[PDB]
Write an enzyme that holds these catalytic residues in place. Sequence first.
Site, short mmCIF file in Angstrom:
data_model
loop_
_atom_site.label_atom_id
_atom_site.label_comp_id
_atom_site.label_asym_id
_atom_site.label_seq_id
_atom_site.Cartn_x
_atom_site.Cartn_y
_atom_site.Cartn_z
N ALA A 42 1.21 -1.53 8.78
CA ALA A 42 -0.46 -1.68 8.52
C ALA A 42 -0.07 -2.17 10.44
O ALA A 42 0.00 -3.08 10.37
CB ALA A 42 -1.04 -2.07 7.89
N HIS A 58 0.59 -3.76 -4.21
CA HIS A 58 0.58 -2.55 -4.69
C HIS A 58 2.25 -2.41 -4.59
O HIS A 58 2.25 -0.79 -5.54
CB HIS A 58 -0.11 -2.31 -2.94
CG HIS A 58 -0.47 -1.33 -3.35
ND1 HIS A 58 -0.05 -0.28 -2.44
CD2 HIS A 58 -1.41 -0.12 -3.32
CE1 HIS A 58 0.12 1.01 -2.07
NE2 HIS A 58 -0.93 1.27 -2.90
N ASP A 59 3.00 -2.85 -4.10
CA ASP A 59 3.78 -2.06 -4.06
C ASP A 59 4.87 -1.89 -5.09
O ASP A 59 5.58 -1.39 -4.95
CB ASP A 59 4.50 -2.62 -2.43
CG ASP A 59 4.74 -2.94 -1.10
OD1 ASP A 59 4.26 -1.24 -1.19
OD2 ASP A 59 4.76 -3.30 -0.33
#
Length: 112
Positions: A42, A58-59
């Site tokens: 990001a 999330h990973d």
Amino acid sequence: ESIESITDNYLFSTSPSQFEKVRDERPHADKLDWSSDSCSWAPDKPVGFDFDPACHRHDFGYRNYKKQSRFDDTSKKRIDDNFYSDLKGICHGNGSCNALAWTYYQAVRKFG
């Protein structure tokens, strides 16, 4: 007691800041991948807020669902939506932070 059930508890039964404290101890690291890019993908980060717990979670979901051979599109959506929920909770109504939360969510939905 199955590793998949444990994985799912970490993903879906903890707040992101609790997940981060779980991750610090690397439970079941013989079976689970605890590595994460911390959303290094990001270019824009929120000033004043820390998205890293959400990124780590999330990973964790992507990497372990793939290792466990159960990364179907509905699970991906569940993990992506849980990530957006995590980010919105970190932002707690801050509009600029929410705008970034939406862009991170869209990035994983379209490019994940």
